[PDB]
Amino acid sequence: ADLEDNMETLNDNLKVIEKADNAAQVKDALTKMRAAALDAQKATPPKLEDKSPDSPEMKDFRHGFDILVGQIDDALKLANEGKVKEAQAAAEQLKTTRNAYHQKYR
């Protein structure tokens, strides 16, 4: 159990992603991740406790998504701009942040 938050909305696209992938499909799947991802980042991810007890807490979260939510967008305009024909190659690649984030709460 972790960001069960952004994850709950992730299972939706993560699923429609399996059978989905073509241009229109994968095109709609991403949009969902963009609107959903924007919520996790824009949403107060209290899971880790926003009450930034130390200080540099929040800003610390804008880093995780900032990177992920940053790739999702490049995956959309990339498929609608024709990065879709060559994308099919990245779709099989995956993203799982190379730095397999910790299991969750360290």
Whole-angstrom distance, CA of residue 49 vs CA of residue 68: 20
Which has the closest alpha carbon to 89: 32, 26, 34?
26
- The CATH number that domain 1-106 falls under is 1.20.120.10
Only one residue has tokens 């024909």, namely: 85
Strands (E), 40-80: none
CB-based contacts of 19-25 (< 8 A; 24+ apart in sequence): 21/88, 21/91, 23/79, 23/80, 23/84
Q: What are phi and psi of 69, to 5 degrees?
A: -50, -20
Reading the block at residue 51, the tokens are: 């009450």
Whole-angstrom distance, CA of residue 34 vs CA of residue 26: 12
Is 58 known to sit in a ligand binding site? no
Where along the chain do its domains lie?
A: 1-106
Is 102 known to sit in a ligand binding site? yes
Whole-angstrom distance, CA of residue 34 vs CA of residue 71: 10
Q: Which residues make Cβ contacts (< 8 Å) with residue 91, sequence separation at least 6?
A: 21, 26
Reading the block at residue 40, the tokens are: 């996790």
